[PDB]
Design a protein around this ligand. Structure first.
Ligand SMILES: Nc1ncnc2c1ncn2[C@@H]1O[C@H](COP(=O)(O)OP(=O)(O)OP(=O)(O)O)[C@@H](O)[C@H]1O
Ligand SMILES: Nc1ncnc2c1ncn2[C@@H]1O[C@H](COP(=O)(O)OP(=O)(O)OP(=O)(O)O)[C@@H](O)[C@H]1O
Lengths: 529, 528
């Protein structure tokens, strides 16, 4: 029995929607003043699980409480199909007649994309007949009354193009994944009535750590965490086989109970296709945070929409370049992507172009560019452009170059790319896309001594000198940080692991100095040139 | 139910030729028996969606029903004659035709006939072939039906059984195309008739040429949306209440801001599934290239005189220039936009390959068949110096063969742009353009006057806003240093200049940003 109070973050959509079904039933003077007859159709579309059906449910439960009462008719996917010849095209006629009978009313076709395909001469004739009848009923010779029609879809572009037209489906709403702010609202909604109410700062801490969560996942963990406390509190519930009596007064949910949940479940977005955005792992942050910050500063310089009347920008492009093994293509760029949230990202990599056996690559490239143009601002991402170039045929090069030349100049679509070879060795076609004079090239340099010292500071001496369940190690740290002054990222994080293996090889020894010599031996056996 | 040939705007030929089939044989019956005519009694409307096909039938019914000469009216939906029993599918048709014959004169209106009369084939059910056979044996058979007028309407004309398209069954075919600049003013007039503060026609006239690509129903939407926007501008506390308020219907007047916002929030129904290859100059760039666009239009007026009847012979033209001068991305699309009312058929790289499930040659032939059918038109081939390198020999031969068979005097322009100068183009492309005839145009850089016009509004007016001798020095310096920059560099300089004006919004005193503007002027360097 939800009534415009279980939603969070969809405020303009609801405001526009109520203008379509509420006002003429309430203020029948302004419309008659001008002879308007407001729009009477809409189409929802967006990725799964973002609250497409809940809005319709809330609106239905809201308007049924008259006066003024409004009917409501629901239809599933393809319910009006029969094996007889003249039945499928008659149920719609019956339904529309019945709806006209009790006007005003609402007809909600649910997942219309499985009912009204694009007409073609190859598929069966029943579909063409049904779509013709459907679009003859909506706007025909005789005018329908106060019926209002709604649709749901996951793939917009597969609806017949004649249905989308002022008169039948004259407004399209985009339902997106929630941004940072809306996650807090959804969490407040789902944990409203709890006797030990959580504090809001805790909710914000949760919200800043949920990236890629879509409406139903947040609802999921709020119930996968209220069960961890139960399983911890009364561990002996699965053993017996009859109903017990409990003490439902000592099972409040602690902060820890949340953490395990975020470790176990994976968001709906990244279940069939991996996402090209990953935050820095807990070990390397004190090696690369500063470089990420500098990169974001420069991008802020050229792409002004990353600031947090409108800003004006002219074809933003940038290229992150350095010697091989400097973490440019495997640590830095995905970190930058993860830092700029609220801008959707479309990727372009060899595993993605050739990862589809049913569509040619140029089709995929065209689709990606069109989508990025549609929901701009956004990011088009292409990594390893020095290997990417000489794998693809000439047709795809020409197509890719001609598509991004048609994007309007002041439209905000960023082009982010990374490479290994220095800028001068790249093929000249790539060269005439980045204009460093304008500030579109960033060079990466190795971390300095302080930063590398911080990298090994917690390994030695805080874990090696921990009781199981103090002066030689300083010289050990000095010799370690002296030895590795010319190591790239791969070799550094290699040498981190070999020490931790010795750390783990001595769990239960209470006496040290049986491994300190082992440690200093291993560090001087390790040789990577 | 008060629409009668007076709410319909822009279609005069179709109305004029439609009343001489159903009005004249009744009213002046003494002219046709002299010659033994029996004037035509079958027509087929067709055209892209939302262009006013059902409106005409509504008007015609409403007109003929009320008057001195009464004519009946039977209406049918898509496939509303079907029944499950074997003997009833085609019996309703016979019942309807007999009933219409009994009350003659009368009219029959088949709506969405493409959903009832598919082209006969043996790859489907056989009931459809039975229905088609009884229909086309019933319209003109052995019985001479008499005074029955049959009408259809559809979007896909090519999917109708060809035995129904020949005189006797469906005589005339009517094309309903999108309105041009003049008819949009008529439609806007029609839809804003009963407004007490009547808008000035000097405002509608301006409003018309901004609505490019709109068609029919879209217009009727805008005239609605504006009103609602106006309401949002007057009583903004109305969306946050669950109880009726007291509204004063006297301060809900419509202003141009409402039209501007409502127009911005909407896209036309035509270019919603695809994108049209014609776009006007943006407001930012307009005072740099309008003169050049006018010059190009004058050359077209020289060789393509459709911009006694004018005569033309295989019109062609080629815009050429050094890279960056803006001929493939700023000039040619503007030319296509100005020459509207000429249907355009784009033909370049992402169109030929960017759609699968078809071969390049099929599309390459279809795009020219359509251009020939709807002459005059335009065939558009941008970036020829690359387009000629990415295709196989089969496509070259098919292309250079498909445009030789067009009738020599047919007015089918071929508009293309290049970047390498005409001498460096390969053979078979220098022979298609014969610049002695006047088929090559050389574009050149803008001179000083428009360059100064380009910057004065930003650096003189906008730089001094409420929330003055050094400005002239800045303007003269900027204009001077930039006497060899192409379009891309000029726009980039504009953007970097406006960035500081943005970033210093909230400081109540100037002279902190003037230094910024300076350093950006000095610290900006180009390549050339
Ligand atoms: N803002 C929100 N507040 C509360 N619940 C939400 C919100 N957004 C989404 N949901 C959840 O979304 C679920 C269903 O929404 P809806 O079915 O319309 O979208 P969807 O599941 O992503 O799409 P589809 O119907 O195509 O599968 C409900 O379980 C609801 O709890
Ligand atoms: N010239 C016009 N003046 C006013 N309204 C117009 C005009 N042309 C079209 N319309 C609008 O177009 C609407 C629909 O026209 P009509 O239904 O006959 O077109 P159609 O070809 O059948 O379109 P569809 O593809 O929707 O079937 C009318 O209700 C009217 O509001």
């Amino acid at each position: 029995s939800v009534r415009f109070d279980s939603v969070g973050g969809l405020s303009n959509h609801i405001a526009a929607l109520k203008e379509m079904v509420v006002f003429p039933l309430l203020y029948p003077e302004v419309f008659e003043k001008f002879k308007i007859q407001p729009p009477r159709g809409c189409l929802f579309y967006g990725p799964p699980g973002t609250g497409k059906t809940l809005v319709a449910r809330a609106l239905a439960n809201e308007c049924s409480q008259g006066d003024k009462r409004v009917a409501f008719f629901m239809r599933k996917g393809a319910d009006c199909l029969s094996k007889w010849v003249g039945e499928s095209e008659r149920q719609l006629r019956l339904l529309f007649d019945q709806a006209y009978q009790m006007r005003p009313s609402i007809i909600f076709f649910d997942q219309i994309d499985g009912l009204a395909p694009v007409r073609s001469s190859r598929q069966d004739q029943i579909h063409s007949s049904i779509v013709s009848t459907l679009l003859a009923l909506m706007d025909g010779l005789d005018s329908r009354g106060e019926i209002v029609v709604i649709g749901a879809t996951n793939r917009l572009d597969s609806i017949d193009p004649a249905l989308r037209r002022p008169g039948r489906f004259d407004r399209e709403f985009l339902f997106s994944l929630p941004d940072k702010e809306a996650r807090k609202e959804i969490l407040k909604i789902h944990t409203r009535d709890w006797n030990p109410k959580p504090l809001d700062t805790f909710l914000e801490e949760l919200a800043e750590n949920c990236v890629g969560y879509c409406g139903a996942d947040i609802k999921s963990i709020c119930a996968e965490a209220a069960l961890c406390a139960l399983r911890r509190r009364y561990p002996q519930i699965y053993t017996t086989s009859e109903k017990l009596q409990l003490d439902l007064s000592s099972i409040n949910i602690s902060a820890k109970d949340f953490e395990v949940a975020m470790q176990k479940m994976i968001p709906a977005s990244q279940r069939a296709v991996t996402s090209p955005g990953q935050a820095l792992s807990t070990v390397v942050k004190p090696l690369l945070q500063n470089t990420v910050d500098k990169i974001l500063e420069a991008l802020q310089r050229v792409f002004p929409h990353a600031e947090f009347y409108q800003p004006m920008s002219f074809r933003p492009r940038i290229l992150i370049v350095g010697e091989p093994g400097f973490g440019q293509g495997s640590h830095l760029a995905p970190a930058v992507i993860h830092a700029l949230e609220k801008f959707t990202v479309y990727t372009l990599d060899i595993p993605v172009l050739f990862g589809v056996s049913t569509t040619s690559p140029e089709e995929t490239c065209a689709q990606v560019i069109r989508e990025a143009k549609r929901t701009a601002p956004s990011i088009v991402y292409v990594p390893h452009i020095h290997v990417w170039w000489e794998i693809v045929g000439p047709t795809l090069k020409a197509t890719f170059t001609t598509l991004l030349q048609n994007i309007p100049s002041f439209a905000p679509v960023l082009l982010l790319a990374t490479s290994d070879k220095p800028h001068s060795a790249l093929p000249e076609e790539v060269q005439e896309l980045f204009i460093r004079d304008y500030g579109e090239i960033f060079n990466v340099q190795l971390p300095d001594k302080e930063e590398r010292t911080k990298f090994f500071e917690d390994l030695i001496l805080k874990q090696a000198a921990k009781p199981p369940i103090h002066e030689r190690l300083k010289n050990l740290l000095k010799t370690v940080v002296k030895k590795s002054q010319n190591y790239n990222i791969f070799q550094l994080e290699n040498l981190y692991a070999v020490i931790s293996q010795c750390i783990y090889r001595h769990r239960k020894d209470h006496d040290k100095t049986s491994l300190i010599q082992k440690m200093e031996q291993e560090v001087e056996n390790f040789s990577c040139s």
